[PDB]
Design a protein around this ligand. Structure first.
Ligand code: ZN
Ligand code: ZN
Length: 818
C-alpha cells in the first residue's frame, strides 16, 4: 500500500521525483537508510541510503539505492565490527516495493579534538579494488540535483570523464581524417610538440641489430675433475618508447569525431642503448639522455602510457643536473642520430624549442641506521627529530647521519609508558616527544615469531597483542600523527592467514585513520636489488591518503608480483605501470664498477677512489661536490679454505659451488686440502660419465647416515653433495654476482654457504664489501656507518633503501598540496 507524500519536487518527461513517500503508512524520505532481503538466505542483509524517489509514467514507484558495504565484505573480513558499514561506489535503481525496513546509519565523524584522544554506523569510504579506506567525500548537493544526489553515481561519472579519450581541439579535416592540436585522456593533456610514453612494441627502430654471433657452449666436461658439474641442469622488460608528437588525427563516425580512433604520428627518440652503441656504449650515459631522430611512427592514442618532458640541452635555463632533479619524467638530448649512416650530429632546428613546504616533525621507530629516514629527508617532506633504536651501533650510526635528532637507545615499550605517564624526560635527560610534537610516525617493527602459515589459536593471538607491531600502533594511537608508515618484509601481509595484516588495518580504522596497504619492489625505484616490502600507509581524517609510487625502473618480472591475496580476494595497489617504465634497470655494474680492488679480509675503512664515477648511478651516489674518501670498502676475512673456494669459482654468469674442481689446493695457511672422495651410490643421481660414484654418505643409497663418512678440509664442501638432492643441488651457494644482474636481498651477514649466498664479487675472490652492500641499497657514499664490519653489514642489510623511501616520500609530498 504505497502512496506519495507532499507535492512533487521536480518533473522530467518520464519521471516525477518526490521528497517523501509513504510505505505502509510509514514516512520514508530521501536521505533515509533502508534494508533489502537477499534471495540467498546466507548473505548479509542489503543496506542502502535512499538518494532519490520518483514515479515512472508506467506506474512504477522507484527509489535510487546507494549501497553500504558491510565490514566483513572488505579486507577486514571477520575482524571488523559487526555494526560498522563503509561507503562504496555501488548503487542502482530499485522499486520501493522491495524495501524490507528502515535502518539508522550514524556518521561517526572525527571529533574536533581527535588528535588528543587515545544502529549501524560508518566512517570511511571503502575502495574494494585497492583496499583503501578513505575520508568520505565532502561533495554537497546543489539545488539543481538536491532531488537525485548520489555520491556513488557522481564518483562513477567523474571516473568515466577522466578515463575517456576526448579531443579538446580540432584543426582541419584532410582526406577523411580530422587533425587536432590537443587531446586528453585520464586527466593528462597532450598537445602538439609534447612527448609520450609507449610500450616497447608500439614501434620499431630502423637501425639493424644483428642477433649475436652466438658461441659454442663450452667443450666436454671432465667429470672426475668436476664431479658436481652435473647438477646444473636479461629478463627485465624494455623501458618505454618515447616520441615527440608531430600530428594528431582521428577518423569520423556518423559525421562526428570518432574518439575511439585517435592516432598520433611521432618522431622516434633513441635511447643510447637503442643505437648501435647498445649496452657496451651506454654504461656511462645519463638514464634520461636521449638522441633525436627524424624517424616517424604512427601509434594508437590508446597505447600512450603517459606524458613526459623532452628538451634540447642548449635551450635550457637551468643546468642539466638541476633540470633533471627538478621534476619527474624529464629527459634531454644533445645530438641527433642518423639511423642510416649510424652517425651522430647536431639536431635539426624544428627539434629545438619555439610556499616552502613545512617539514613534518617525524618520529622514526625501529630506525636502524636511518635508511628510511634518509629517503624521507631526500624528498624534503620530513625532519626526523626523534629516533628509537634499541641496538646501539645502529643508534650511533643514526646520530652520525642526523646530528639534529634525539636518538633514544632504549626499549620502546618503557619509553611510551614514560610519556603516557606525563614524564618529560627519560633517565638520561633526553626530552621525550609529546602529544602534538609528532606529525609523522614511521617505522619497521620486527615482526618476528609469526612466520609460516599455521592458524592462529588462543595462544598465538595474544602474543600479537604483546608484539612490537602492537607497540608501533600504540604509538600511532597516542600521538595521532598526520601520516603513518609501517614498513616490513613482504610476508607481513600473509603472516598467519593474513591475520596480522587484518588486525593492523582493523586497528587503524578503529582510531579513525584513513589507510591502505601494498607491496613495492625496491628494484623499481633505482636500486640493483630484489627487495619486496609490505607498506601500510595511514592518514589522519583531515588529510589525503597517499598513493603508492609508480615504478621508475624496469625490473625482472619474477621479482615484481606486488599483488596480495587475502581470503582468496586479490588486492592490488594504485600502481598502474604493471610492465614497462621510464628508466632502464640499474645493474650490479652500475652499482659498483668504480670501486678500487680489495682483497679478502681488507680492513682499511678509508681509501681514495682511484678513479672517477663511471655510471649514472655512481655519479648520484658520490655527488657533484667534493669528497676524496671511499668509506667502508672493507670485506670479511674468510678461512684459508673459504678463500680458496672463492679463487676457484669461475667468472662466467651462473657459476657457483657445482663448478668447483675436485683437486688438492694449497691454502693460505700453507696446508693442502685433500680431495673429496665418493664412496657411496646415489640411486637417484646414478653413476657419472667417468664411471665414478656420486654419493658421499650411506644415506644416498638410501640407508641412514654413516658414522665416519663425513669429510673435512675439502675444496668441494663435503656437506653440499650430502644433502644436494633435498635442496635443488644448492644452486647459488658460493655463487658470483653478475655484472649484468642484481643483488639478491641484501643480507645482514654475507656468507657463501648462508641462506642467501650469491655474495661473491663478479671478478674478485671475496665477498661483497660494506660499501658495495650500501650501494646495493641506495645509500650515498657520504652516509656513515659504525662498529665492526659485522655491525656495519647488519646496519646496511636492515635499512629501507633510501630510493624506495624517497619514492614513498614524494607521494606523501603530494598530500601536503591538492
Ligand atoms: Zn547512484
Ligand atoms: Zn648421509
Amino acid at each position: 500500500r504505497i502512496s506519495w507524500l507532499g507535492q512533487p519536487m521536480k518533473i522530467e518527461e518520464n519521471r516525477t521525483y518526490y521528497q517523501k513517500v509513504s510505505i505502509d503508512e510509514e514516512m520514508l524520505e530521501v536521505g533515509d537508510c533502508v534494508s533489502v532481503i537477499p534471495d540467498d538466505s546466507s548473505k548479509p542483509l542489503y543496506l542502502a541510503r535512499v538518494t532519490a524517489l520518483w514515479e515512472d509514467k508506467n506506474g512504477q514507484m522507484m527509489f535510487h539505492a546507494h549501497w553500504f558495504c558491510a565490514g566483513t565484505d572488505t579486507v577486514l573480513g571477520a575482524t571488523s565490527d559487526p555494526l560498522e558499514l563503509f561507503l562504496v561506489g555501488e548503487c542502482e535503481n530499485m522499486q520501493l516495493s522491495y524495501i524490507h525496513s528502515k535502518v539508522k546509519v550514524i556518521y561517526k565523524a572525527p571529533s574536533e579534538n581527535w588528535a588528543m584522544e587515545g544502529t549501524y554506523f560508518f566512517q570511511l569510504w571503502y575502495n574494494q579494488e585497492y583496499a583503501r579506506f578513505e575520508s568520505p567525500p565532502k561533495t554537497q548537493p546543489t539545488e539543481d540535483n538536491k532531488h537525485k544526489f548520489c555520491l556513488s553515481c557522481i564518483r562513477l561519472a567523474e571516473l568515466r570523464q577522466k578515463e575517456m579519450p576526448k579531443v579538446l581541439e580540432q584543426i582541419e579535416e584532410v582526406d577523411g581524417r580530422v587533425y587536432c592540436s590537443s587531446i586528453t585522456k585520464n586527466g593528462v593533456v597532450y598537445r602538439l610538440g609534447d612527448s609520450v610514453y609507449l610500450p616497447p612494441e608500439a614501434f620499431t627502430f630502423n637501425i639493424k641489430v644483428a642477433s649475436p654471433v652466438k658461441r659454442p657452449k663450452k667443450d666436454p666436461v671432465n667429470e672426475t675433475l668436476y664431479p658436481e658439474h652435473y647438477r646444473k641442469y636479461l629478463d627485465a622488460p624494455e623501458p618505454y618508447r618515447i616520441g615527440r608528437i608531430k600530428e594528431i588525427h582521428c577518423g569520423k563516425k556518423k559525421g562526428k569525431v570518432n574518439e575511439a580512433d585517435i592516432k598520433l604520428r611521432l618522431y622516434k627518440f633513441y635511447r643510447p642503448e637503442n643505437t648501435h652503441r647498445s649496452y657496451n656504449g651506454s654504461y656511462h650515459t645519463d638514464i634520461n639522455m636521449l638522441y633525436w631522430s627524424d624517424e616517424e611512427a604512427v601509434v594508437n592514442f590508446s597505447d600512450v602510457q603517459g606524458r613526459c618532458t623532452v628538451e634540447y640541452g642548449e635551450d635550457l635555463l637551468e643546468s642539466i643536473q638541476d633540470y633533471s632533479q627538478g621534476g619527474p619524467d624529464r629527459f634531454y638530448f644533445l645530438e641527433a642520430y642518423n639511423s642510416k649512416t649510424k652517425n651522430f650530429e647536431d639536431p635539426p632546428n624544428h627539434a629545438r624549442s619555439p610556499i616552502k613546504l613545512p617539514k613534518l616533525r617525524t618520529l622514526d621507530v625501529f630506525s636502524g641506521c636511518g635508511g628510511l629516514s634518509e629517503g624521507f629527508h631526500q624528498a624534503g617532506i620530513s625532519e626526523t627529530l626523534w629516533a628509537i633504536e634499541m641496538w646501539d651501533p645502529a643508534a650511533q650510526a643514526f646520530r652520525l647521519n642526523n646530528p639534529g635528532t634525539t636518538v633514544f637507545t632504549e626499549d620502546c615499550n618503557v619509553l611510551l609508558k614514560l610519556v603516557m605517564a606525563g614524564e618529560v624526560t627519560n633517565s638520561l635527560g633526553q626530552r621525550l616527544p609529546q602529544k602534538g610534537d609528532v606529525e609523522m610516525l614511521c617505522g619497521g617493527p620486527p615482526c618476528q615469531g609469526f612466520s609460516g602459515m599455521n592458524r592462529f589459536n588462543s595462544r598465538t593471538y595474544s602474543k600479537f597483542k604483546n608484539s612490537l607491531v602492537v607497540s608501533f600502533l600504540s604509538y600511532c594511537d597516542y600521538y595521532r600523527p598526520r601520516f603513518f608508515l609501517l614498513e616490513n618484509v613482504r610476508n607481513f601481509v600473509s603472516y598467519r592467514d593474513s591475520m596480522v595484516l587484518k588486525l593492523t588495518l582493523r586497528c587503524l580504522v578503529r582510531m579513525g585513520y584513513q589507510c591502505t596497504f601494498g607491496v613495492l619492489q625496491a628494484g623499481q625505484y633505482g636500486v640493483a636489488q630484489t627487495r619486496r616490502r609490505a607498506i601500510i600507509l595511514a592518514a589522519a581524517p583531515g588529510e589525503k591518503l597517499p598513493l603508492f609510487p609508480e615504478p621508475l625502473h624496469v625490473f625482472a618480472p619474477r621479482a615484481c608480483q606486488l599483488s596480495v591475496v587475502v581470503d582468496d580476494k586479490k588486492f592490488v595497489s594504485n600502481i598502474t605501470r604493471l610492465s614497462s617504465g621510464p628508466f632502464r634497470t640499474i645493474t650490479v655494474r652500475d652499482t659498483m664498477s668504480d670501486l678500487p680492488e680489495i682483497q679478502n679480509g681488507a680492513s682499511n675503512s678509508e681509501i681514495p677512489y682511484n678513479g672517477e664515477p663511471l655510471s649514472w648511478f655512481q655519479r648520484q651516489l658520490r655527488g657533484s661536490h667534493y669528497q676524496p674518501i671511499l668509506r667502508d670498502h672493507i670485506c670479511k676475512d674468510m678461512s684459508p679454505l673459504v678463500a680458496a673456494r672463492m679463487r676457484h669459482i669461475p667468472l662466467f654468469p651462473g657459476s657457483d659451488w657445482r663448478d668447483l674442481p675436485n683437486i688438492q689446493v694449497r691454502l693460505g695457511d700453507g696446508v693442502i686440502a685433500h680431495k673429496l672422495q665418493y664412496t657411496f651410490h646415489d640411486v637417484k643421481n646414478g653413476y657419472s660419465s667417468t664411471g665414478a660414484l656420486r654419493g658421499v654418505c650411506s644415506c644416498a643409497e638410501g640407508k641412514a647416515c654413516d658414522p665416519e663418512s663425513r669429510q673435512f678440509s675439502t675444496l668441494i664442501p663435503w656437506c653440499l653433495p650430502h644433502t644436494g638432492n633435498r635442496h635443488n643441488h644448492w644452486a647459488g651457494l658460493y655463487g658470483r654476482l653478475e655484472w649484468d644482474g642484481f643483488f639478491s636481498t641484501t643480507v645482514t651477514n654475507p656468507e657463501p654457504m648462508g641462506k642467501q649466498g650469491r655474495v661473491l664479487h663478479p671478478e674478485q675472490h671475496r665477498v661483497v664489501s660494506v660499501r658495495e652492500c650500501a650501494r646495493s641499497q641506495g645509500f650515498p657514499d657520504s652516509y656513515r656507518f659504525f662498529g665492526n664490519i659485522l655491525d656495519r653489514h647488519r646496519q646496511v642489510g636492515n635499512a629501507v633503501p633510501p630510493p624506495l623511501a624517497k619514492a614513498i616520500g614524494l607521494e606523501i609530498k603530494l598530500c601536503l598540496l591538492s
